[PDB]
Amino acid sequence: ALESAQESHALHHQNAAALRFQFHITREQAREIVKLCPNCPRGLKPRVLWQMDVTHVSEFGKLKYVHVTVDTYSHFTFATARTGEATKDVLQHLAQSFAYMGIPQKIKTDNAPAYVSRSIQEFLARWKISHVTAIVERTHQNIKAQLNKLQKAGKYYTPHHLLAHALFVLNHVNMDNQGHTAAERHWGPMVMWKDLLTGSWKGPDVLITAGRGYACVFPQDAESPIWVPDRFIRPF
Amino acid sequence: LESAQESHALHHQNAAALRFQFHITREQAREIVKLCPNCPLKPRVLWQMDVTHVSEFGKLKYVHVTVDTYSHFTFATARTGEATKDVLQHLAQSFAYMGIPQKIKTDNAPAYVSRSIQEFLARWKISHVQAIVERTHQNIKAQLNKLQKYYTPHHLLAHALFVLNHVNMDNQGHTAAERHWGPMVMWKDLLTGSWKGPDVLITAGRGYACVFPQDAESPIWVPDRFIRPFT
Amino acid sequence: ALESAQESHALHHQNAAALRFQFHITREQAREIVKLCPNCPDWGHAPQLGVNPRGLKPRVLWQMDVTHVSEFGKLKYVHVTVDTYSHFTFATARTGEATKDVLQHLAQSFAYMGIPQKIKTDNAPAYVSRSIQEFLARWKISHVTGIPYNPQGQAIVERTHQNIKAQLNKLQKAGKYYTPHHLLAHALFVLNHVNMDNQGHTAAERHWGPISADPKPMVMWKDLLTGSWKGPDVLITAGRGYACVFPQDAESPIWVPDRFIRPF
Amino acid sequence: ALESAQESHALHHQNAAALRFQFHITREQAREIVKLCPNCPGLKPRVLWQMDVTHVSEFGKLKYVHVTVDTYSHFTFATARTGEATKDVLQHLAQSFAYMGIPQKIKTDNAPAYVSRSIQEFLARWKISHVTAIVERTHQNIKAQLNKLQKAGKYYTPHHLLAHALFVLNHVNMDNQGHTAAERHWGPISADPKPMVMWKDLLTGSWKGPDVLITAGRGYACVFPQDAESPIWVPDRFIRPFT
Amino acid sequence: LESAQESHALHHQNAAALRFQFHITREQAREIVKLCPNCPLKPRVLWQMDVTHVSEFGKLKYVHVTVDTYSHFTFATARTGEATKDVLQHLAQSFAYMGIPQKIKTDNAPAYVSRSIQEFLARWKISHVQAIVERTHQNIKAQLNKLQKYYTPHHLLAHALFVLNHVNMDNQGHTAAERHWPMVMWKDLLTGSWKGPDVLITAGRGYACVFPQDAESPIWVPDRFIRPFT
DNA sequence: AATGCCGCAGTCGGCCGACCTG
DNA sequence: CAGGTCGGCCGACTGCGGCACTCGAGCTACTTCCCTGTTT
DNA sequence: AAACAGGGAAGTAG
DNA sequence: AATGCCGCAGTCGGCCGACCTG
Ligand SMILES: [Zn+2]
């Protein structure tokens, strides 16, 4: 339990709450995990209002242009690094952002010429999206903090790999105080049964439904559930 | 049935997306898609990861696909090759896109079973080991063909990913993303009296069950007297 | 051993007892082996499941359907409306059936019985047409539809059709009647004030009068939605095919067939 | 609440007592509700009846209306008929028996159709004695109800209108004591065998009742509100006995 | 008739090849091909070769394909991968199978543009520097799926190659093998509406013979109603 | 100048051995 | 430990229905939709 | 030129 | 858009006042 958390943060550098919820540990245990770690020292509903801006990362070199797309509601963070910040670059990042997240309606940007350019406006209007002119810079701080943690973890061949790892650890596996990862917030009965083919009481495993005296017990068989008469089931 | 024409012209999604996002007739959506010229468990358990070649991208012909075996959520990238380096990069981005599963059922390519990938997968607590992956291949190729003027292969590839995931949905109305972040029964018809199936069971209770055949559009209510537990 | 049984069944589709006696396996194993084969036909002779609900208070839940009394000539379309708690019945003989005819029959039945909380019918076009819907809305009466092509959903009024037809045949054989309206009036009079049950209560004494509450028993109860025997619970009513338990935590009474009720 | 009372009075136009007893409105309030309406100005049941034939011009061809009133409960049944002859009177008698039941004896006037041998022998078959100011009152009441229901001229035939009027007069109109005509006619009138208990609804937090009880046990009681549809389980802390 | 049935059951050739081999009606060929459940300048000038994956070959999913642009003569050998040694072996075996070219067309994969392969091709006086190869890939995959029980992947691949090469013939009745070893504007004289373009078979002294790809038989038209194309 | 039957599946229950504990 | 207990086992029982010589056609009735004569 | 109003067909259920 | 039913008639079985009888 403890050593699993140690290895997890050592090669992954998670925060405290997510690790605690994953391994069911003491709060202190996670606190000294954070301390002893050397590398690790708005709308009303999802997909309504978005914020995006560019920022410069020193160690990315030719990929210093970091485009960040954060949903103002759930703070689901997505980011990519490209060679520039021109209209073509912003269009490419918007394409991959729509790929990553979905269809937004409200987008808030800065006064950059590329953002107020005609090509981006007509592209958004074609996709039925409205473009109008704290969150973005605090998200940038979080992203670059994750980066600063992650260099010494191991080898990272290209900045794209490092950026993907950082955004993953910041969205899909990290969570809030309420045990809720930003990723799922963007979209937010165990039984004992008798395998009466072999007569062995295999389990426990989840139940799905019931009826007709038949319980839809679903073992780890990724193919299909199986039906068992309720005379051959016992609650756990 | 007004915006559906331009929506299809932009994305080229299936008729189910039209009928569920625009509240139009099923036959109307079928006519729209036919007339178009360019249109001729639990999540995160088991994964399939294969490489495929597409000649459109040129030297970026090495497309890596990673489709979840439950929700059919699809991710892909185009890279200069298919070596261990490249599959490692694509695997990192796929994890960033879909989270951490526990089993990735892959083929027997030498780069896939090499050392570096092996300890990398060991560190992150993953196991190892088909029609789903080739079906996903066919869907990706069809979508890429249907997308014909984009900037770079990454652009239209991401667009294809987006339309495949967040736009299309099955008969139930649940998209790939919704299935990824959100029952099998034999039933008897009442008109002919002959059994048909097997079909999915939405919900049931107190003598009447709801059945949603994949070939139909609307749910069917049947009395519990005519329900059989397939498999 | 078991896999040999599976392949032998897949080849021949033997009987369950045949597999049991030939391969020395547990009987339930043979039953499951014969169950899992897609080729073997699925069970059609299913025992009784489900039950038609019925309001525990008079004038709560009605049922309605039409029939065909061919002896009436042009007035063969008979509308029948029967309560579910007391089996109080009413009927008229309207030429054809439509929105106007159903509305007139509904008004007559309302005058004859009273305001019902809700009405359950079949899915005939007249009962599905909007006009009836806003009529009931103005009269503050909920409406239900029922599963298409399922007469068991209106089994109560179907049995009432049987009773009415038998009574009409009896009366027609008895003597001479002026018009089908007179004959129907006499038949409804008999069925609603004379055809007493075996508990000293006519139809009127049940539909009206006081609801009787003797100390009701408590029984074990199989909840079909969880595959478990949970109880005990209060039993409200019972009969030849229905039972109405009412657990404290349950928001509403639950209707289950008799065989799922075990005394405790 | 009271707006629903006004809507119901608009639909049916029953007496004020019915509104004040069915919707818990103030008596005077229901009084002005009735006022604001544009067109609003024996010892045992099934024993003694009275029958007469009246005329109403609005029906035109069905002006022959038969009225059959019980003398204890005023339970009224009526029908619009094409003639006052013996056969129509017999049809109305059969339908009235279907509506109300078997009366011990019927008191009527000296109409020639009534005295006819066919009616006498028909009553002889059904064992109902025949003998030659309650129904002329009923003629006023039915006529008044027809006038008030003429607001919504969507009635297909006089049968529809008469059915609506009889429905109101027999199941909706309540006496000054709080009883409809049908309850008096079917006469369950006696001491209540079962207690009628107070009840405290959770949604309103008030003591609403009294309501009839079904069962009880293990800290809960199975109360069954009059207007409701299904029994409601209630904690005993919110249950008060009532006489 | 029945011989055609068994031939299509074994080899699963096209309708045209069956018709030309067994002398049946074109309608019969269409019916028989639809009925089967398993059915849903000069040679050696320029070549195209691109590798593709076939999942059901396991360790040998890296199948190479070489198609001549003239006669659509195809060749394939499933191998370990698409590295330098495998592509060199496949190229040598293709040379043995098909004959010496002058030019080869490939994509810009590192293996193809590798120094060793370029040096070897220069050693053979062959130069080196896009829908036919993909159509060939689709045909090969269709045949591989259609041919289903065989023993080894090489056996099944060889059988499918034989079916696609020495059995299937085009509308003209010429085998891909025999083909391996002009456009005209023609007037449909019946309707009077121009059609084309199509291949000219023979022409001279006022009359010509034109064989459109959609017709079962040659069409003879006079010289007055023939015009060139491109 | 001849009469409803019964397999399929669910289910109640008694027997009996492995197993608990007086 | 062996008397006491529970689960595996299945004997016995039973609710259900359709086998009967084959299958239809058609009516009433309301809604939604397309087509077309009439409008400004 | 676009709008609007009958009618027939069609789907559907008793 | 939300679930079989029950009367005609047979019949077992118990209650009980009457009748035989130890
Ligand atoms: Zn399209």
TrEMBL record, chain D:
Residues 195-243 bind DNA. It is found in: Virion. Residues 42-189 form the Integrase catalytic domain. Residues 1-41, 195-243 form the Integrase-type domain. Transmembrane segments: none annotated. Homotrimer. Matrix protein. Capsid protein. This is Gag-Pro-Pol polyprotein. The lineage of its organism: Viruses, Riboviria, Pararnavirae, Artverviricota, Revtraviricetes.
